[PDB]
Design a protein around this ligand. Sequence first.
Ligand SMILES: CN(CCO)c1ccccn1
Ligand SMILES: CN(CCO)c1ccccn1
Length: 144
Amino acid sequence: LPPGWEKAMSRSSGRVYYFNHITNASQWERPEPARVRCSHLLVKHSQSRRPSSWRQEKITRTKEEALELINGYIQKIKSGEEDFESLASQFSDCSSAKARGDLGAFSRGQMQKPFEDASFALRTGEMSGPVFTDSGIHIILRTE
Ligand SMILES: CN(CCO)c1ccccn1
Ligand SMILES: CN(CCO)c1ccccn1
């Protein structure tokens, strides 16, 4: 299986699925360059390195509450009810919200390590599950 993937069993359905422990992605179907380009949606919490953003001068939500927000955004993106870029522009606690979450292209050794590892393990067009860094919890979309 591709880098980071394992088989798992659904508890509710009992059907086999696949999980990536580097990107925290999960899917039903059976699934390196110098640079990648990614967008992200960041939800900060009270233990972020800087608990403030353009949305909120004092970020007060707990880590648990931020993960619930991330999970809900992932649900709406996967259902097609909302687009990643729309949710990033509206709700990302990163200044890159103004650019639909786009961070541009980057190499290894620039970003926070868990973010970097998830970005390089995604395939082009693929999106992560919740990725935890010192900034908060991220949804990552690899665009190039
Ligand atoms: C302590 N809890 C709740 C118990 O499962 C957290 C904390 C951070 C993220 C998710 N759950
Ligand atoms: C990639 N960044 C900086 C990262 O915080 C952008 C992009 C567009 C607008 C503002 N910041």
